[PDB]
């Protein structure tokens with residue numbers, strides 16, 4: 069599923085991501101924009117052989133199991149395939165664990181490089197929430 073901007077904002081808020089660990093909803097929408105272009109099916113291979121999955125490009129190195137990332141962990145206790153669902157529940161639950169890990173949203177390199185410090189409220193501008 070490819071979400072619309074306000075549609076995703078609404079789903080993230082419904083799943084309790086809005087202001088989670090102090091990160092306003094626009095931060096989460098901005099991160100998703102640049103991680104996956106709002107596409108739940110997005111997958112991208114990393115040079116280290118791990119793969120990133122879903123709207124928030126959660127990495128198989130630490131967070132989910134894909135059965136082909138040697139030496140990795142599965143700290144969200146989910147198959148990475150669960151992170152590609154049209155329903156964002158698994159991605160949200162796992163993102164909550166990641167963002168609580170110590171470095172906040174800096175875990176998402178695209179968030180650090182493209183969203184952090186910017187006018188992230190623009191991402192939820194005009195949305196019925």
Ligand SMILES: [Cl-]
Nearest residue numbers: 072073101106
């Ligand atoms: Cl957009």
Ligand SMILES: [Cl-]
Nearest residue numbers: 092093094189
């Ligand atoms: Cl915001």
Ligand SMILES: [Cl-]
Nearest residue numbers: 135136137138
């Ligand atoms: Cl593995």
Ligand SMILES: [Cl-]
Nearest residue numbers: 134135136137
């Ligand atoms: Cl493979």
Ligand SMILES: [Cl-]
Nearest residue numbers: 140141142143
């Ligand atoms: Cl694990």
Ligand SMILES: [Cl-]
Nearest residue numbers: 133146147148
């Ligand atoms: Cl699994």
Ligand SMILES: [Cl-]
Nearest residue numbers: 079154155156
């Ligand atoms: Cl959903």
Ligand SMILES: [Cl-]
Nearest residue numbers: 089171172173
């Ligand atoms: Cl923080």
Ligand code: NA
Nearest residue numbers: 128132140141
């Ligand atoms: Na893994």
